[PDB]
């Protein structure tokens, strides 16, 4: 139960931030290399605490 509960929270909050970062689709300058970085920025924060 609790293994799934953490997963559900982690996925919702990842979506909550992507809803700003890239779902805004603000330019065609959004290289995949920045997508990889932003993911690692999210992972770094979840790893830190």
């Amino acid at each position: 139960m609790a293994v799934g509960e953490a997963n559900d929270f982690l996925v919702s909050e990842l979506k909550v931030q992507l809803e700003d970062q890239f779902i805004g689709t603000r330019t065609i300058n959004t290289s995949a290399s920045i997508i990889k970085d932003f993911i690692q920025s999210y992972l770094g924060r979840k790893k830190r605490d």
């Binding site: 805004g24 330019t27 300058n29 290289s31 290399s33 920045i34 990889k36 970085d37 920025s41």
Partner: protein, 139 residues
Amino acid sequence: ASEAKQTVHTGNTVLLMIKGKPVGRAQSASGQREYGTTGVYEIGSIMPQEHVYLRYEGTITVERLRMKKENFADLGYASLGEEILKKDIIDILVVDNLTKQVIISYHGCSANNYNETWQTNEIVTEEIEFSYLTASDKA
């Protein structure tokens, strides 16, 4: 000839980028990084026995002309007073201008000082400085 064929970076083949946004018309930027390295010492010897890493210190400084519209203050990415209490972390990236691919990334920047200058015959200029958690690069 073409800027993609040289083996070395220069100012005009690089683009400053920020969360969801290209910055542009930046003058310069410098990233300082230190590992606080310290040398272990022994009796019976004058040479250091080894060197140990102790603390990661680092800063990024940014230097830009004051734009007439949607400047740093209006955007708030460097900002003033007790609004700082509600200015979250920023990520700052240095990107190949022709390809839009990352050269390096700074994680977790937040302000350290923010200054400007005015003079009669000159451009209004701004100095910004952030402290950050980690530098990085990947592919």
